[PDB]
Design a protein around this ligand. Sequence first.
Ligand code: 4KX
Ligand code: SF4
Lengths: 375, 438
Amino acid sequence: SDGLFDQFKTWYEKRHDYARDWKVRTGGQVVATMCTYTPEELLIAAGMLPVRVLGAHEPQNVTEPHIFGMFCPFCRDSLAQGLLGRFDYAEGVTLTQSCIQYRQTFGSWRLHVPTVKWDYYVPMPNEVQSPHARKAHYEEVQAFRVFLQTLTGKEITDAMLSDALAVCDENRRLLRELYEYRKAADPKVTGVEALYASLTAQFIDKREHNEMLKKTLAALPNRKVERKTGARFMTIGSENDDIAFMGMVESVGATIVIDDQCSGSRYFWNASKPEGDVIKAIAERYCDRPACPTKDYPAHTRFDHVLGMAKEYNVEGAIFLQQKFCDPHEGDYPDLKRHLEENGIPTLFLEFDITNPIGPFRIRIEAFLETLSEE
Amino acid sequence: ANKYPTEQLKLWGKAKELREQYYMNYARAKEKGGIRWSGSAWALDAIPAGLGEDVYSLTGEPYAAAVAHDRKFAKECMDAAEAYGFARDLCSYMRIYWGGMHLNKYAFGGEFPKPDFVFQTQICCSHSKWYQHVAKEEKIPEFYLDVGVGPYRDMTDARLDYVANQLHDGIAFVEKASGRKFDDELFIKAVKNEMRSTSRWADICALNKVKPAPLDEKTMYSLYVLCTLSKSSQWCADFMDELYEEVKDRVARGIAAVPNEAIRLMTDTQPPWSFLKIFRYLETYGAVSIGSLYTFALEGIWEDKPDGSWGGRTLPWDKGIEINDRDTAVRLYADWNLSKPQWQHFYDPTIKSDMMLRIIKEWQVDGVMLHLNRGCEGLSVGIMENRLAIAKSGTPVMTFEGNMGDEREFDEVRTQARVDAFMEQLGVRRQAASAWSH
Ligand SMILES: CC(C)(COP(=O)(O)OP(=O)(O)OC[C@H]1O[C@@H](n2cnc3c(N)ncnc32)[C@H](O)[C@@H]1OP(=O)(O)O)[C@@H](O)C(=O)NCCC(=O)NCCSC(=O)C1=CCCC=C1
Ligand code: SF4
């Protein structure tokens, strides 16, 4: 009703218009980014706007010659956005290594999207638990810096990197402050509103996004809550960026109070540590971040992260949203499910294609709510 | 009609016996206090070899492939994994392996033998998840080597450092997990034998460039497998040398695997293991498969030769490079493995496209049959871009959908009809070419 989050909703709906106008105002380049491990500080320091590729959740046939249909809907939907010309304003494309399926989106995009002027693949270590991974990633981040300096012909100094890191860390801290409100019994921020904020963080200028988050937080102390909370849900998955689906969940008698997904907490959760070598601060922030399943071995540190979030936000039920064919999350799913259930959190499993009729999922959510109402 | 002389391989029985002995040794490892470990065929098995000559692996994918050849047992294993709760679209080898562990049945008889530890390479996402479940169910230590440092051609000092330093951690891990002291001499011998076996497998594959091909791919599946069992063993290296001598003699005598050879085909990844009869069917057309990047380089290690051709990689000691200490051996061992051709498409599918185009040229291939393998994300990533690159090149190329480990996603009838249509296509193209050049 009060429209507090409308700016984030507009930014999401009009993301492409925003990027084009950003180029007019700043004269900078736009870079299509893939996977949340992209070291965006480096792109910001180089004067560029990082915009995360996401899907459109509409029917598409353009990817069949490029990606075999055994691979997930997200990697195909994402590639379709490039092939359809919807990122034609982006001079660059970059991916930082995680899931192997996503690497196909990057490979096919750099080969076939005719507006790409440059590309870069960052082989971030997967084994962030190794004592050698932070040194390796330090050198990867430095190498990307050298690449960007060469590409733009402008020195990217430590001061420039430190200013970009400050902007990113402020965004991460502000998003965490926003999330704090979701711990209340009657949250002043819905899960949908939190999602608009955390997703747009990934494709709006961070300086502009931080200003909007600061306005949002200035308004929350006195914001009036009219809706009833209903059941306290957690959403768990890879990306989880279908806001329309989340809106259905919150309309049937529930609130999504926390999440484990790259549209949300897994993107922003930790700020960097205070540290004088800015390359180390940047590289280690990503290594220390809650891990993608692909990067979570030998220990399943994710299980403790997810359960800790569930307890801190007083979750009553956890909903696994899984992309069809998603190997990293499929590999973790049976035992993550058991871990939550053994700790008193009932779970629900839902699987998604590029598009999905909402009717069947709502029936499942309503049946899940009836189960919570009994024990 | 039979234009070429043909002969069965003399070392066939030995190839089969070495593989059977490998599986029996894993099961019997404890009778004399041996060590057992498990991990991928891509694990760096010279590291556990530093712990003794009685260190026996079970490599996960070749074991699962052996199970997949027994359709009934593979179905039972997959059903057990599904009962635990795993998605049926996960890697079919991993599901098979998991199921057989829960059923507690070994394909070669007896209980499923418990490994002492997991020693794994991680490049495919499923590489960790496979053994995380195993290590939890068996309650054993687990070590993973992250080899994800990007294409070999782009390698830096720091990337190689990352892999080498992890290998030093792996040495410490296997010492602690086993209770034994690592022996540099045994380790270095194992590095050298792995270099020998993987380069020599490539040398053997390179002999298949001649007409007639001395080996057919179905036969090769019983030969490339040895390096997937224990590439760092003396037995595997020595057998590769012996096999090379036999295949050289076949070339010298004009011996064809397929006496009516008229068509040379190339395949790609992971054939459906309970349907290898498709190869024999193609032989009736005079079609021989000369191999694939998979058969040649799942373990084979290659280099560019002085004439530009592809052949086995030069052993360091034939290049004046000494290997006389642990640290030197670790870094050379890391570098050797990072050059594996079948790791490169995990980063850049065009590297594999170019490798496939090169095989088509150097092995004189007439047509390409690509398996769109729903059972293996790791070897299937990029496959459609590879198909496109072959299609643009002018070489005939077809696809068929399947799953190497799960027959429920392989349609025998449709696939055979697609392959028969492809043989017709190759005949039509030959008629047109003849008619145009008179
Ligand atoms: C055992 C097998 C499955 C089947 O074998 P066979 O079909 O040969 O059956 P058989 O019952 O044993 O013998 C009957 C046959 O012997 C023939 N013959 C007789 N005398 C012969 C002679 N003197 N010379 C030549 N041939 C001779 C007869 O003609 C007859 O054949 P026929 O009926 O058609 O006429 C075999 O293909 C094999 O080992 N595959 C490897 C599986 C595997 O482990 N792969 C590694 C996976 S690792 C991996 O994927 C990854 C790793 C890492 C990362 C990701 C992936
Ligand atoms: S999907 Fe393929 S590459 Fe990955 S674990 Fe399975 S057999 Fe190995």
